[PDB]
Ligand binder design. Structure first.
Ligand SMILES: [Mg+2]
Ligand SMILES: [Zn+2]
Lengths: 123, 192, 396, 237, 49, 148, 114
RNA sequence: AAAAAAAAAAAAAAAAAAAAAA
RNA sequence: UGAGAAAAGCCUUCUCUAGCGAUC
């Protein structure tokens, strides 16, 4: 594995993440794409960032971690873009996604747990 | 080096002589700098904060420093040319007010004949046109120095007397301007 | 309470001896003056040894060892020499204390009164070691702070974009600065031979020919033959002699001719430096951002970095904003600047610019975060736009 | 709208030393640029007639949010040595470097290697910033690089913020010095309430021989954040 | 009142350019509206108090 | 004005209640033989962690051996021991200052004079002993409080 | 006495030595305009002024262009002016609103005066 | 609060400036 | 408030910090 994809999730935590992405799309709380993920970081409306480590140039998504460290936003990698494609409800591979702040959303409890799990990966 | 050396021409020559800090110790700078200054210059060489520079970077710095000394050398040649023409066209003015200040006066008036048509009080305040029209509109006190401020006689005199010398210098100056413009003989006897 | 303290500094290692101290009430309002006031500190603490670092590289080696907690040979040499061999040695780091006690027989203590003594030493350090070292203590920390930081992150000095920022600005100034001088030269030589401005369409080219012929009085035979070599075509040079023979310009004085000759030469020497600056910029761009340079050219690519202010700032921008950086100068709209095979219709002029912005954003990211820069990706992206340009132009 | 480029505008000093107010149709907080002509994160700068000031964004900065909220003291003044924990990319660090001026020093600590490469590029242009790419939880590992400082600014955003500040304060902070700590309520304890968290952190600070003096919220810009200002080992009066 | 000034002593008045009066008229009209605005806000505060 | 308050309603007061105990509240609790932690749990149906300041603890110590039982109950590992650096021993001023600063505590006291001061501070409940049961005054989520 | 006078001519070391500009009818016109910024736009409200008098130390300048803000925030070069007063003279929105209010005040005053 | 005086502006208003009552 | 109020120049009495000094 390329060492630049440091927060690589295991099998169990990947299942929880891709389930939460599929839930978020139904509640209109997901922004899809590398450019759209960047824009939410500027506006400070992201809980976390999910990126695909199987992009053939890994460098095209490495600008997102730099923005995350300033906003103190957790971020993780997954092993497949095509698996990330279906969970987002899109018919094309996706290399980056961002879940948005929504006031009063019922996803807060599930989101709060997944943020804590990501921070544990960084020990 | 920038703090220790203020002479810009001396600074650019030192860079041309010595590229990196390592060459400062071995090379000698007696011809460019005093030995006491050279010792301090060599003293700063070992205790330095700067980053090391590549070979392509140091070449570009030398080329820029090459152009600096060539422009400065030409500027001195241009200044000497100006002194040659000024002493040939209006020699009486150059002796009295100076080469630079007399040259600016013709540049403001645009020609020697146009400057000749002016009176004595106008020559005094040729430079100070902004203070004059501000004073006349607001009914304040008019300026008194003009371009004459940088003349040799005005510079040496005391600040209390710089008002008197301004009109005394200007009034005699126009006697030199008329004589050079209309006289058919080139001599500095009247100016002296 | 007599004990020894080891203090590590950027300039070197120091060994100090403690005579007496009121240990229990040290952290109290009245007693705290014992360490704060310089005179009282000198009463109870002396400097028994000092071994400064010889060079910056040596200082970096000791900094690595101290952070890891191992006993470097420089530290061991000082400790063995001036310490009698029932010895208490104070250290700020528990790990270095254990390593010393394994290497040598001294007893190490890491806390208690020693923690307060070390702060007293740190606050008054510049006074104790003043004049013992050539390089100042304040500069010692500033110099070491960088070299320690470069080592951790594997910084590469080649891949820095300071020079391209300065070079683009300097190119802008030179283009104006040569232009102003070139117009003045043409006016001055116009008094002597006004026809020359009509034949020559280039300001720079006018300058060498101003050098080459001093007066129109002597331009014939071999000097005419020399003239055809500098001029691009032989036909004009034969007309130049005809213009020189029949011209209404005025003879110039001696001292006036020497002035204009030296001045016209200086514009040439300024122009040749400008060509060298453009050469130096091109070499820098391949080392810094090869993929972007291959995509759009060294001139446009460097200017895009200049608008962003840095290479990293260019990568962080989204695809939408990178188009705006070229809006005022029409970097993406104006295509021949960047030259691409094929041409874009007026209807699809906006679409090609939008598509080209996305490719430049991707190429900029590859240059910034690659372990080694390589221009293969830029060439691949160049081909794709050309396929798109042919797609719109031919319809397939 | 806003402050469009090319508008006449006035710059007057703030109550704090080294900080300026950009008086116009709208008012912005500005600091004097140490390196004229350069923007570190794309802010709008103002040219004054050889002198230039840079706008300070309170949404992207935690110190600027406190100043706009009306904090009494910041203790960052020209010619002061400031130890910064959690420098990140250097958005706030650049403005702190502007306040201290050429005489003062800023010690920037950032563990991450990705953001560390940005500090070194930033420290190249500013001579008074000393980059320290090291973990803030172990102050003994970089005791070579740092002398005594006057102010410690903490933006580490960790569950153990107080312990990290306590270790660094004992080792490097001079007697009578001051500290500014930003507290993110969601970071220390998400389960407990935000207001009870602010009471717990203050309690721990008093157990570490630190005397907190003031606190305030940053509500118009941030939610569930607080800034605490205090003094370390005060001199007797 | 002391309105009278002799013929020899009196000075000609200032003759303003058209641009200056446009700037000068703007400020007085602006100040009248602003002075009116503050006075109205004064009574609202006093009534509420 | 603090952000925790929505007019007179304290939102950030949470199911873990931090309670500042006055020195007199301890004495009457023993006289009525009410367990200090257990009775608070019955009043609020939630976890309660009483808080003991340095000022309050000193006033117990000055009372003498006659009040030794109250002193031993005060040192209970389940309790929260919070320090205060206040030049003196008087505790009423200590508690109101803690109340004014943070707005997260519930005041437990039986003195009438202290209660009338705390009522002037918005958004802070007061706990007092009524009959042989604990009672709460200005709390919306009182739940299992004496009904009268 | 003379050393006091030298120290009051500058803001001090705390603010990097700002100098007090000489007071002119153009600078004073600018300061009066800024003090009355509340009534420029009926839909915008402002806080109270910090000080009743004019500031002693201040400097005047213009905001630098930024390349990324070509469309978002940039005034075209023809609309730019030299002074704050001339900017107020140019825009139609302010002139239209100010004229309508000022006409009302005179008319209401005329009813009171008669 | 109020009777004044000195300036500008708009088709009267606005800034300063004194006295008197309270 | 009522050694009336306001301004300039000379002596007298004292207050704060900041280095400096304690290393034999
Ligand atoms: Mg009591
Ligand atoms: Zn207390």
């Amino acid at each position: 594995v390329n060492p630049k994809a440091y927060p690589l999730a295991d099998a169990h935590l990947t299942k929880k993440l891709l389930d939460l992405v599929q839930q978020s799309c139904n509640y209109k709380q997901l922004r899809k794409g590398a450019n759209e993920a960047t824009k939410t970081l500027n506006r400070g409306i992201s809980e976390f960032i999910v990126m695909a480590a199987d992009a053939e140039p890994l460098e095209i998504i490495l600008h997102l971690p730099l923005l995350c460290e300033d906003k103190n936003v957790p971020y993780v990698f997954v092993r497949s873009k095509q698996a990330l494609g279906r969970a987002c409800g899109v018919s094309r591979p996706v290399i980056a996604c961002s879940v948005t702040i929504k006031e009063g959303s019922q996803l807060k409890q599930q989101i709060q747990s997944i943020q804590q799990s990501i921070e544990r990966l960084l020990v | 080096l920038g703090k220790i050396i203020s002479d810009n021409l001396t600074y650019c020559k030192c860079l041309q002589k010595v590229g990196d800090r390592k060459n400062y110790a071995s090379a000698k700078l007696s011809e460019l700098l005093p030995e006491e200054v050279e010792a301090e210059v060599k003293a700063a060489a070992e205790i330095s904060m700067g980053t090391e520079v590549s070979e392509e970077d140091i070449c570009n710095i030398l080329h820029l420093c090459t152009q600096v000394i060539e422009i400065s050398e030409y500027r001195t040649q241009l200044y000497e040319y100006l002194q040659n023409r000024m002493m040939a066209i209006a020699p009486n003015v150059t002796v009295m007010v100076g080469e630079l200040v007399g040259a600016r006066l013709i540049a403001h008036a645009g020609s020697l004949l146009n400057l000749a048509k002016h009176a004595a009080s106008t020559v005094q305040i040729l430079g100070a046109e902004k203070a004059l029209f501000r004073a006349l509109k607001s009914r304040r006190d008019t300026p008194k120095y003009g371009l004459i401020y940088h003349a040799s006689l005005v510079g040496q005199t005391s600040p209390k007397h710089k008002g008197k010398i301004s009109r005394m210098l200007a009034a005699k100056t126009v006697l030199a301007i008329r004589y050079d413009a209309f006289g058919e003989d080139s001599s500095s006897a009247m100016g002296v | 309470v007599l004990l020894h303290v080891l203090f590590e500094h950027a300039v070197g290692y120091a060994l100090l001896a403690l005579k007496e101290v009121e240990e229990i009430s040290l952290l109290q309002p009245q007693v705290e003056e014992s360490v704060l006031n310089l005179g009282k500190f000198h009463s109870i603490v002396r400097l028994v040894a000092f071994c400064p670092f010889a060079s910056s590289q040596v200082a970096l080696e000791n900094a690595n060892a101290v952070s890891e907690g191992v006993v470097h040979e420089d530290l061991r040499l000082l400790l063995e020499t001036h310490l009698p061999s029932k010895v208490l040695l104070g250290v700020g780091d528990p790990k270095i204390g254990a390593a010393i006690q394994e290497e040598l027989g001294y007893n190490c203590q890491t806390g208690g009164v020693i923690a307060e003594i070390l702060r007293g030493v740190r606050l008054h350090f510049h006074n104790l070691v003043k004049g013992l070292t050539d390089l100042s203590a304040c500069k010692a920390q500033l110099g070491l702070g960088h070299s320690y930081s470069r080592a951790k992150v594997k910084f590469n000095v080649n891949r820095v974009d300071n020079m391209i920022i300065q070079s683009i600005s300097l190119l802008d100034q030179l283009d104006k600065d040569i232009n102003t001088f070139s117009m003045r030269v043409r006016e001055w030589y116009g008094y002597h031979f006004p026809e020359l401005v009509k034949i020559i369409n280039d300001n720079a080219t006018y300058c060498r020919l101003a050098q080459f012929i001093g007066n129109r009085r002597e331009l014939n035979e071999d000097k005419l033959e020399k003239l055809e070599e500098l001029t691009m075509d032989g036909a004009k040079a034969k007309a130049i002699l005809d213009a020189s023979r029949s011209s209404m310009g005025m003879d110039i004085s001696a001292i006036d001719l020497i002035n204009i000759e030296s001045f016209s030469s200086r514009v040439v020497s300024l122009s040749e430096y400008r060509q060298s600056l453009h050469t130096y910029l091109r070499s820098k761009m391949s080392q810094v951002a090869p993929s972007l340079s291959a995509l759009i050219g060294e001139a446009v690519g460097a200017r895009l970095i200049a608008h962003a202010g840095s290479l990293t700032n260019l990568a962080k921008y989204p695809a939408s904003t990178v188009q705006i950086l070229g809006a005022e100068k029409a970097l993406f709209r104006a295509l021949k600047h960047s030259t691409f095979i094929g041409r874009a219709a007026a209807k699809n002029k906006g679409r090609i610019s939008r598509y080209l912005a996305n490719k430049c954003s991707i190429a900029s990211r590859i240059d910034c975060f690659s372990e080694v820069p390589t221009s293969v990706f830029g060439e691949k992206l160049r081909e794709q736009v050309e396929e798109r340009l042919s797609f719109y132009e031919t319809g397939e | 709208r806003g402050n469009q480029s090319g508008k006449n505008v006035m710059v007057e000093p703030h109550r704090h030393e080294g900080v300026f107010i950009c008086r116009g149709k709208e008012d912005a907080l500005v600091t004097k640029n140490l390196v004229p002509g350069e923007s570190v994160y794309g802010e709008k700068r103002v040219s004054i007639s050889k002198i230039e000031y840079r706008a300070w964004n309170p949404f992207r900065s935690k110190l600027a949010a406190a100043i706009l909220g009306g904090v009494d003291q910041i203790h960052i003044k020209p010619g002061a040595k400031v130890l910064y924990l959690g420098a990140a990319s250097g958005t706030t660090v650049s403005h702190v470097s502007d306040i201290v001026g050429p005489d003062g020093l800023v010690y920037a600590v950032e563990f991450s290697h990705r953001s560390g490469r940005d500090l070194i590029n930033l420290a190249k242009k500013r001579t008074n910033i000393i980059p320290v790419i090291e973990d803030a939880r172990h102050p003994h590992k970089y005791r070579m690089l740092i002398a005594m400082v006057d102010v410690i600014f903490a933006d580490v955003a960790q569950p153990d913020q107080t312990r990290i500040v306590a270790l660094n304060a004992h080792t490097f902070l001079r007697n009578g010095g001051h500290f500014v700590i930003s507290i993110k309520a969601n970071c220390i304890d998400s389960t407990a309430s935000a207001e009870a968290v602010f009471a717990s952190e203050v309690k721990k600070m008093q157990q570490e021989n630190m005397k907190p003096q003031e606190q305030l919220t940053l509500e118009p810009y941030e939610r569930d954040h607080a800034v605490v200002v205090g003094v370390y080992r005060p001199p007797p009066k | 009142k002391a309105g009278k000034v002799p013929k020899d002593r009196r000075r000609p008045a200032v003759i303003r350019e058209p641009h200056e009066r446009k700037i000068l008229a703007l400020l007085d009209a602006l100040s009248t509206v602003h002075s009116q605005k503050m006075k109205k806000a004064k009574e609202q505060r006093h009534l509420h108090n | 004005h603090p952000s925790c308050l929505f007019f007179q309603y304290n939102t950030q007061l949470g199911p873990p209640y931090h309670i500042l105990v006055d020195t007199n509240f301890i004495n009457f609790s023993i006289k009525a033989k009410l367990d200090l932690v257990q009775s608070m749990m019955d009043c609020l149906y939630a976890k309660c962690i009483p808080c003991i300041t340095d000022c309050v603890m000193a006033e117990i110590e000055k009372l003498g051996q006659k009040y030794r039982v109250a002193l031993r109950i005060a040192k209970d590992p389940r309790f929260e021991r919070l320090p205060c650096t206040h030049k003196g021993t008087y505790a009423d001023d200590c508690l109101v200052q803690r109340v004014t600063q943070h707005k997260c505590y519930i005041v437990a006291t039986v003195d009438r004079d202290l209660k009338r001061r705390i009522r002037k501070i918005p958004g802070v409940p007061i706990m007092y002993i009524s009959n042989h049961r604990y009672n709460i005054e200005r709390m919306p989520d009182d739940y299992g409080a004496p009904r009268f | 006495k003379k050393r006091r006078k030298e120290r009051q001519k500058t803001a001090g070391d705390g603010w990097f030595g700002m100098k007090a500009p000489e007071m002119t009818n153009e600078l004073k016109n600018d300061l009066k305009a800024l003090k009355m910024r509340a009534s420029m736009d009926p839909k915008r409200f402002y806080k109270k002024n910090d000080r009743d008098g004019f500031p002693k130390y201040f400097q005047i300048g213009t905001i630098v262009d930024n390349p990324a803000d070509f469309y978002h925030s940039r005034i075209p070069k023809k609309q730019r002016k030299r002074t704050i007063v001339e900017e107020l003279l140019a825009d139609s929105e302010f002139r239209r609103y100010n004229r309508r209010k000022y006409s009302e005040i005179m008319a209401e005053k005329a009813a009171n005066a008669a």
